[PDB]
């Protein structure tokens, strides 16, 4: 995240997808054993290359010495066509506690109104000379889909007003979270696209509400030989 700030403490539903012993993406823990994330987060199709760190604040888990849970990835289900989503199934369940929790998903078709306040979180690119490692957040407002103009219904358009801030490489897969019904929900999944923290150039996020059925169909179903 570029032009964001550190979080006071760690965010329970945030996952660091590691590839080859190193952060590459964020994800959202949507069940004790499922993480909603992005396609661009998997250079290879072989599972032995991945881990999921939960309950961390630091990217290397430095102060999280007792908070953190490291889980292997047993499966990988891919989303429809131009969705870019992937659900990682975790090897053994995540232990919910004070540091790890899950975030709710919206209802199949929820329309988020414009000028609504939203947050992105990530350990990705910051532009700092020496990034401290801490999870960072930036604030964005939902905008009309026409402002993102590079199909459309699966997408959300959110940006900051005038200042250039937002997610970048390493933040892919993480959530765009807002306040819809009673509490916090993963409304969007961060995907690369419209540059990185360009002023008056809002980001396009995959609309979770569009693939909401699919996410549910998958969260309650057997393994089945993938690939």
Domain boundaries, the chain: 1-11+103-210, 12-102+211-227
Helix (H, G, I), strand (E, B) or coil at 214: helix
The H or E element containing residue 215 is helix 212-219
Contact (CB, 8 A) for 157 and 112: no
Torsion of CA 154, 141, 188, 59, to 10 degrees: 150
Long-range residue pairs from 185-188, CB within 8 A, at least 24 positions apart, any chain = 185/103, 185/104, 185/105, 185/106, 186/13, 186/28, 186/30, 186/36, 186/103, 186/104, 186/105, 186/106, 187/106, 187/110, 187/112, 187/118, 187/156, 188/118, 188/156, 188/158
Instruction: Give the single-character DSSP code of 172.
Output: T
Q: If we measure between CA atoms, which residue out of 189, 174, 158 comes closest to residue 59?
A: 174
**Cβ distance 54 to 100 under 8 Å?**
yes
**How far apart, in whole angstroms, are the C-alpha atoms of residue 57 and residue 133?**
8
Give the count of alpha carbons within 13 A of 205, CB side only.
35
Q: How far apart are CA 110 and CA 123, in angstroms?
A: 28
What's the distance, CA 65 to chain centroid? 23
Rg (CA), the chain: 16
- Between CA 91 and CA 89 the distance in angstroms is 7
Residue 85: strand pairing partners: 38
Distance CA 217, CA 212 (A): 9
Structural contact between residues 204 and 147, judged by C-beta atoms closer than 8 angstroms: no
For residue 120, with 0-12 CB atoms within 10 Å meaning exposed, 13-18 middle and 19 or more buried, which class applies? Answer: buried
Q: Tell me whether domains 1-11+103-210 and 12-102+211-227 share a fold.
A: yes
Q: Which of 103, 35, 22, 18 is nearest to 75 (CA)?
A: 35
Per DSSP, the three-state class of 86 is: strand
Measuring CA to CA, how many Å separate 129 from each of 8, 81, 125, 126?
Answer: 21, 38, 11, 9
DSSP letter at 14? E
- Residue that has been written with the tokens 């700092």 in this structure: 128
Q: Which fold has domain 1-11+103-210?
A: Thrombin, subunit H (2.40.10)
C-alpha dihedral, 157 to 158 to 163 to 169, nearest 10°: -90
Is CATH 3.50.50.60 correct for 12-102+211-227? no
**Whole-number Å distance between alpha carbons of 125 and 143:** 24
Query: Cα 173 vs. chain centroid, distance in angstroms?
Result: 4
Resolution (A): 2.5
Please enumerate in sequence order all residues whose Cβ is within 8 A of that of 182, keeping only pairs 6 or more positions apart, or say none: none
d(Cα 39, Cα 123) in Å, to the nearest integer? 17
Taking every pair of C-alpha atoms in the chain, what is the biggest distance, in angstroms?
48
Q: Which tokens in the block code for residue 95?
A: 């232990």
Please say whether the beta carbons of 185 and 178 come within 8 A. yes
Which of these, 83, 115, 101, 84, lies nearest to 31 by C-alpha position? Answer: 101
């Amino acid at each position: 995240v570029v032009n964001g700030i550190p979080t006071r403490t760690n965010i329970g539903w945030m996952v660091s997808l590691r590839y080859r012993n190193k952060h590459i993406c964020g994800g959202s823990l949507i069940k004790e054993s499922w993480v909603l994330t992005a396609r661009q987060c998997f250079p290879s199709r072989d599972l032995k290359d991945y881990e999921a760190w939960l309950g961390i604040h630091d990217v290397h888990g430095r102060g999280d010495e007792k908070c953190k849970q490291v889980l292997n990835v047993s499966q990988l289900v891919y989303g429809p066509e131009g969705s870019d989503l992937v659900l990682m199934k975790l090897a053994r369940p995540a232990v919910l506690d004070d540091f790890v929790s899950t975030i709710d998903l919206p209802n199949y078709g929820s329309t988020i109104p414009e000028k609504t306040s939203c947050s992105v979180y990530g350990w990705g690119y910051t532009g700092l000379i020496n990034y401290d490692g801490l999870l960072r957040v930036a604030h964005l407002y939902i905008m009309g889909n026409e402002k993102c103009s590079q199909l459309n219904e699966s997408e959300i358009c959110a940006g900051a007003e005038k200042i250039g801030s937002g997610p970048c490489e390493g933040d892919y897969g993480g959530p765009l979270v807002c306040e819809q019904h009673k509490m916090r929900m993963v409304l969007g999944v961060i995907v690369p696209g419209r540059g990185c923290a360009i002023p008056n150039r809002p980001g396009i996020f995959v609309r979770v509400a569009y693939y909401a059925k699919w996410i549910h169909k998958i969260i309650l179903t057997y393994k089945v030989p993938q690939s």
